[PDB]
Every structure is written in structure tokens, then in C-alpha cells.
Symmetry: none
Subunit: 342 residues, 2 copies
């Protein structure tokens, strides 16, 4: 009775630190299948196997170029195969999954995937097909706003330094139609959306370092008690920076509020600003509720295992870690019932 | 102490008349697994299990059309897994084997396969991988020629009647490279090859009923004493028809000669024509040597337990049956040696 997690993300197979945070919570070390194709996207842990959804492309790079179809387009993807093989793994049956090697852009011969305890499917289209969506036990959508997507390319993406800003936004133009038509709509099916926006604390900041990030959590979901702050259901702003907790400019600002998201009820926890000192993280964790921690400080402790990770100092790393614990709480209850259900 | 037989044929899993005749020699009756899956291709007998090699397909039927690669192509098959489960079966450890459902054309959930006394793997690629080739205690290749493959599509294959002659000949072409590249070279590794050609007794015959059939048998193989006619090693043409054995047209013609086949020494036994009367089969068996029969007429009696089978009146049925006995003789000496060794 293996558990399947969806993660809709745009950062490309292999460049998601969200995936690496979930992995550290779930198991030990995700390493490619020992021996075999060095271009394989699959990552295997003691508990978890991450599958890249590019592997189910129905069109290679030259293929897609021939049809002038992007990788965002459902035409370029085989959802029948994805659906059948996620189904088989969830029911304990191995699959021959084709490998999409990114260095050559060809659809490579398949690899034998063994059912794990936790299966995470990650890529552009995890929740696009209703049949695949019904197999997911939890659904995540990482929503990067266009404004920090562009900032991160300027401030961090070393490989696009060769391109000017005029052609980098002209790269975003020709990708937006396919993205908004086929990628963005998947948010409505996620149990947890993490939305990364520019910061409102310092005016006109476009650097992508200080971030306003929203954690949107679906209500009414079995085994998922959303995080809350002080008074669940209420609308709160909370600035912990004060006399007993000094912060540098511009500090930490929190918002907790209910909301309606795609005609679904959600509750939203927000963080704007970034942690100066570790005291601020510990103070923040000590005042949040329904974190699904097993001991005191696990959120902070789980983050300190990856102090080098991008976003370890703002709500991005804070909420991605919290999400991992919530999923762990869910699959513990989910396999607690299936253990007794034989 | 399990025996592994290789059977290379492109007629398709579940279409092998050759396989039916072998199981009748080897065991009681080959049935599908009890319960299991209605589309399972494994066949089970008291002595033998037949494993279709489509079950080790790595690419879906729908994926095969997506990547533009045929089923003859190794990229569409997982030989690592196939070698594992045959190495596992020969070494007597049971295995969960996947199922290729030809109806949906989908890679189905697996079925449990217990190590049998005799294990046969049949399909397009039993001798393709040297690893797998080293597990086989005997190797068979059924070489249907392109002129008989074509006639059979016309005269018998009812599903082809929707297609035109030009379309069928243009379909055979589009399959030939992968067959030339991946299937046909497996002939060199076979201990026994059966080759089906258009008959030479009727000029310009293209109907696939009267056939020239060659049984190619490797020499120097341990526990395999090839069939011979009258005088082993010599070059003989023998027409049994005469005063004492009246035949109908075009009659029977036998050829027996040594040959070199892929730089291996072989003996070749040939039959052209078809038995029009039952007396001729008995006459032919009475005059053949090294048949590995347990009693007089076992070749003929074994055939009559499948009178309906195609090729039951020509060299196709005669040689496929004789091949079964030769393997039975081989695995008994082969079992006796390792049964002796284990005590």
C-alpha cells in the first residue's frame, strides 16, 4: 500500500530544493539507481523514489521541435502511460519507465522502477490528468511569481548571464501562453500551494532574496490539519520583532487568514522578510501550531541539516519544511489505516 | 536442476504449433495458469512451463508506436530482467514475471511462475543475449522463408484479407531490417533449425501447402545425436514412392547431406512434398535412423494425437515432432548426469 505524492514545479527535474527538503524529512539520501543510465532522472532513497515527469514525454526535443510544441503542452506528454504506471506502483507493481535524458533530448530505453514506500512524482503536469490526480495522496504546487522568476534568473542563474534582459523576458513571453493554459490551472487541485512573491517590507525590491511567501493549505482534507497561528480561523498579522527579539532591517512579518481558493476553502499562513539570526526561527516555530512535529524544534532542526540550501533564511525554506512534516503526519495516519486494513 | 529450452520464432506467442508438439512429448497437456489472468501467455504442463518472451517487453504497444521502434528491436525489450528470471528459474528460485496482454497491448501486473522441470522460452529473442544464450541447454530456430510467410498470409491468415497484396508486401518490407538485424542472426546459435521453403516438386507453387522443409542439426553437440538416413555422413536423395508404396502427386522426396552452417558443421535432413496417405509417414519413420524414439512408431503416434495441426502432413510436422524427441533424449541424459552428480 505505497503512497504517492504530487509536486507540480517549474524549476526542472533535478533543480528543486523543495524536493530535497521533502526527501530529507522522508528518508536518507536520494541517489540515482545504482548502476545503469547516468542520465536517469529517478532518485531513490531508503523510503522514497522521486520520478521526473519528463520521463513520460510523448515527444523528444527534436520531436517537440518538429511539431513546434513546447514541453508544457499536453500533446508532448503521454498521460496514459503516466497514469498506468503510477497506478501499478501504488498497487505494488514495478514498471518499465522510459528515461528522458536531458543532455541529448531523446527518449531513452526504459528503466525498471521498483515500488517504494513513498512515491513522489514531480514535474510540469502531475495533477493535469484526472486519473493521475485520483492516485495522489497529497498534492503540492510551487507557484513562483513572474517577478522573482525573472529576478532569480538575473541574480542566481549563472547560465543565463550570456543573455541580456531583453531576451530573457522575451523568453518568458513565448512560454507564458502554454504555462497559464496548462500549468497554472493545476493549483486548484493541490492540498498545499506555496506562492513566492516579492517582499512588501522594503519598497521596490527586485533581488529575490527577501521574499513574501504564502502557504495555502486546503481545508476539509482528511489527515491534514493546516498550520495556524495563535487563533485558528481568525485574521492575524504578527511581527515578533521587538524588545525581546531584535531583528535587522526589515525583519519578519507574518499573516494568518482564511481564504477561498478556486472555490475551495483554505487557510493561508504568510511570511514576509527573512531571518537574521537563528533566534528568530526558534521563536517563530515555538509560536506556531499544528506543525506536525514529533519533538520540540524539529522544523528548525530539519532546516539546520541544510543551512546551505537556498531560501533557508526565509519562508520558502520554512514552509517547504513544514509541508514535509505535514505530509509525514498524513502518510503515517494513511498507512496506519492500511496496516490495519491489511 | 531445471532444463532451459530456447525456441526462436516470429509467428507469435500462442501461435506456435511447434510448441504444442514439444509439450506433448515433454508432458501431459499445456494449460493457462489456473485463475490468474485471462490474457496470461504462460502455459503450464506437469513437466514443462512455456514462457512467452513478449512478457519481457520493456515498451508498451502504445509506447512502441510513440518511439518509432518495432517489437523486434532490443530497445523494446528488457534483457536484464529476462536474463535474471531465467537464471533464477534454472537455478530453481521462483520469480514474479510480468505479463504482456496482447489484447489491451499493455504491460500487465505480474504472475508467479514456479521453476519447472523443463522451461521453454519462446519468442523473437531467446538467443539474442549471450547471457541468456549460456543458460539454454538446447536452442531451436524456426526459419520460415519470405516466400512461405507471404503465401500463408494470403491462403490462411484471415485477418490479412482486409489488406491488399501491395499493402501486405509493403508491410513485410517495413519489418525486414529489424528481422534481418536482430532475429535472423540467432540461427547461428541454434542446435536445430527448421527451414520452410517453397516446394521444388511443383513448378511455380506459391500456396504454402506443399513445402520444402530442411532440418538443420548441429554436429558435435553433447547428448544430441542427429537424425540420419541410411548412411550417416553421405549425400543421399531418396524417393520412397514406388511399386510397394503408391504416392499421389507430387509425392515425397528426401534429401540428406552434410553441410557447414555459420561455420558450424551440421547434417541436413530434408523433405519436399506432403504425405497424401498415412502409410507413407509410417514408411518414412521405418527407414529413418537416430530418432530418439522409445518405441516403434512413436514419431507417427505422437503426430496422430494432433491430427488437426497445420503441417501435420508435410515435413513441418514431421521434423518439429522429431525435434521434440531429440530434446527429450537430451534432457534425460542431461538430467541423469546432474542427478548422478548430486547423489
Amino acid at each position: 500500500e505505497t503512497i504517492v505524492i504530487g509536486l507540480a514545479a517549474d524549476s526542472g527535474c533535478g533543480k528543486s530544493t523543495f524536493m530535497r527538503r521533502l526527501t530529507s524529512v522522508f528518508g536518507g539520501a536520494a541517489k540515482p539507481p545504482k548502476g545503469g543510465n547516468p542520465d536517469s532522472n529517478t532518485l531513490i532513497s531508503d523510503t522514497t523514489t522521486v520520478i521526473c515527469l519528463d520521463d513520460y514525454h510523448s515527444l523528444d526535443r527534436y520531436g517537440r521541435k518538429e511539431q513546434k510544441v513546447t514541453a508544457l503542452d499536453p500533446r508532448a506528454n503521454d498521460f496514459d502511460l503516466m497514469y498506468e504506471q503510477v497506478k501499478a506502483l501504488k498497487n505494488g507493481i514495478a514498471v518499465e519507465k522510459p528515461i528522458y535524458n536531458h543532455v541529448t533530448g531523446l527518449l531513452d530505453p526504459p528503466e525498471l522502477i521498483q515500488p517504494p514506500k513513498i512515491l513522489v512524482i514531480e514535474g510540469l503536469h502531475p495533477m493535469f490528468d484526472e486519473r493521475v490526480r485520483d492516485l495522489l495522496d497529497f498534492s503540492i504546487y510551487l507557484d513562483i511569481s513572474n517577478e522573482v522568476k525573472f529576478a532569480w534568473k538575473i541574480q542566481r542563474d549563472m547560465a543565463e548571464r550570456g543573455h541580456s534582459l531583453e531576451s530573457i523576458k522575451a523568453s518568458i513571453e513565448a512560454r507564458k501562453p502554454d504555462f497559464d493554459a496548462f500549468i497554472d490551472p493545476q493549483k486548484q487541485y493541490a492540498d498545499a500551494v506555496i506562492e513566492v512573491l516579492p517582499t512588501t517590507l522594503i519598497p521596490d525590491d527586485n533581488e529575490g532574496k527577501v521574499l513574501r511567501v504564502r502557504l495555502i493549505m486546503k481545508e476539509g482534507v482528511k489527515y491534514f490539519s493546516p498550520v495556524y497561528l495563535f487563533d485558528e480561523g481568525s485574521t492575524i498579522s504578527w511581527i515578533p520583532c521587538g524588545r525581546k527579539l531584535t531583528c535587522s532591517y526589515p525583519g519578519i512579518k507574518f499573516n494568518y487568514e482564511p481564504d477561498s481558493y478556486f472555490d475551495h476553502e483554505v487557510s493561508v499562513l504568510e511570511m514576509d522578510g527573512q531571518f537574521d539570526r537563528l533566534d528568530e526561527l526558534i521563536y517563530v516555530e515555538s509560536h506556531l501550531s499544528n506543525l506536525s512535529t514529533k519533538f520540540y524544534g524539529e522544523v528548525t532542526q530539519q532546516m539546520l541539516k541544510h543551512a546551505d540550501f537556498p531560501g533557508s533564511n526565509n519562508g520558502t525554506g520554512l514552509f517547504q519544511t513544514i509541508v514535509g512534516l505535514k505530509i509525514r503526519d498524513l502518510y503515517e495516519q494513511l498507512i496506519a489505516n492500511k496496516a490495519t486494513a491489511r
